[PDB]
């Protein structure tokens, strides 16, 4: 995911990254949460 | 354009992007004398030469 | 500057430096200009950048910002003369030796 999906110039839909963050959180994926946080997703704007 | 005191300066808390880092910032005019800005970095931001 | 930011990300991953990396950008071209309005107030910023918007966000791990406004928005050239004059004024200052 880091070496292909998160390459430079990758277009991202609005709200899809937070949905992926939720899906990574419910499935207990530590490194995907790390990758999504390092790739722009912020906890303050996400967690409701 | 008209000239006025600034309203956009302080500290920025970078939310997201992994590591949390705080960065000072000022909005300045493009025609300001650089000596005053140098005094800003040396005094207000506590940066050595 | 994105490569410099990646370098500083690696720097914060293996060294205890606080590298002073004052970046000078146009005030009119940074995304979310209303988010950075305050007077000695800590303002949160979003590192997410919308690809549709022509405006770009600031680099996430710089240390200081001399964001310069010529009045215009979305256009460059508001910072080159100020940066060159500030570099000249710094170079005229005598070193501590």
């Amino acid at each position: 995911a880091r070496s292909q999906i998160f390459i430079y110039g990758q277009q991202w839909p609005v709200g899809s990254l937070e949905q992926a963050m939720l899906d990574a959180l419910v499935l207990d994926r530590v490194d995907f949460v790390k990758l999504l946080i390092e790739n722009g997703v912020s906890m303050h704007r996400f967690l409701t | 354009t008209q000239l006025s005191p600034t309203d956009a300066f302080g500290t920025i808390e970078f939310q997201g992007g992994g590591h949390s880092n705080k960065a000072m910032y000022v909005r300045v005019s493009f025609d300001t004398k650089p000596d005053l800005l140098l005094h800003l970095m040396t005094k207000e931001w506590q940066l050595e030469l | 500057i994105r490569h410099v930011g990646d370098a500083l990300k690696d720097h914060a991953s293996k060294s205890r430096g606080k590298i002073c990396t004052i970046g000078i950008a146009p005030w009119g071209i940074v995304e979310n200009q209303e988010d950075l309005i305050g007077r000695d107030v800590v303002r949160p910023y979003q590192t997410m950048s919308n690809p549709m918007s022509k405006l770009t966000v600031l680099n996430s791990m710089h240390s200081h910002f001399i964001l310069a406004d010529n009045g215009t928005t979305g256009k460059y050239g508001a910072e080159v003369k100020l940066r060159r004059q500030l570099e000249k004024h710094i170079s005229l200052q005598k070193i501590n030796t």
Side-chain angles (χ1 to χ4, degrees), chain A residues 1-6 9-10 12-13 15-37 39-44 46-48, chain B residues 1 3-12 14-18 20-21 23-30 32 34 36-42 44-45 47 49, chain C residues 1 3-5 7-8 11-18 20-33 35-40 42-49 51 53 55-80 82-93 95 97:
Chain A
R2 154 173 300 123
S3 49
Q4 270 81 357
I5 316 179
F6 282 110
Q10 171 66 71
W12 277 106
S16 67
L17 275 196
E18 293 176 351
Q19 198 41 69
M21 172 36 68
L22 186 44
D23 294 338
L25 273 171
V26 298
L27 292 165
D28 208 342
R29 301 268 199 274
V30 160
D31 289 345
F32 272 88
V33 172
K34 292 188 44 61
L35 180 65
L36 281 154
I37 279 170
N39 271 260
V41 185
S42 78
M43 261 315 147
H44 302 81
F46 161 70
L47 196 61
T48 64
Chain B
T1 182
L3 259 288
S4 88
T6 78
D7 75 321
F9 65 101
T11 317
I12 282 165
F14 279 99
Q15 273 167 2
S20 55
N21 157 69
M24 320 287 289
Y25 78 109
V26 202
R27 204 224 290 200
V28 298
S29 176
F30 84 114
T32 49
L36 177 63
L37 280 76
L38 185 53
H39 174 244
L40 157 81
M41 293 177 182
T42 51
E44 271 83 15
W45 283 347
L47 292 172
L49 208 66
Chain C
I1 311 113
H3 295 307
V4 168
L8 279 156
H11 174 46
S13 87
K14 183 190 183 69
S15 295
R16 263 75 174 255
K18 299 296 183 181
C20 201
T21 173
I22 321 100
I24 305 173
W27 163 257
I29 74 149
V30 47
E31 228 174 305
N32 292 321
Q33 266 156 76
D35 282 25
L36 312 178
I37 301 298
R39 300 210 168 145
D40 324 312
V42 176
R43 313 292 294 152
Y45 196 52
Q46 303 298 132
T47 51
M48 215 91 102
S49 57
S53 66
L55 278 79
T56 68
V57 297
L58 286 178
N59 190 275
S60 65
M61 321 181 20
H62 276 50
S63 70
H64 300 85
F65 285 100
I66 318 291
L67 324 159
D69 204 7
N70 70 334
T72 82
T73 52
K75 285 183 287 298
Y76 282 87
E79 92 270 17
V80 185
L82 174 62
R83 175 171 159 179
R84 183 79 206 92
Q85 286 168 2
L86 197 143
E87 287 162 345
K88 288 177 188 290
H89 191 273
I90 277 189
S91 84
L92 265 299
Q93 305 311 285
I95 208 182
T97 77

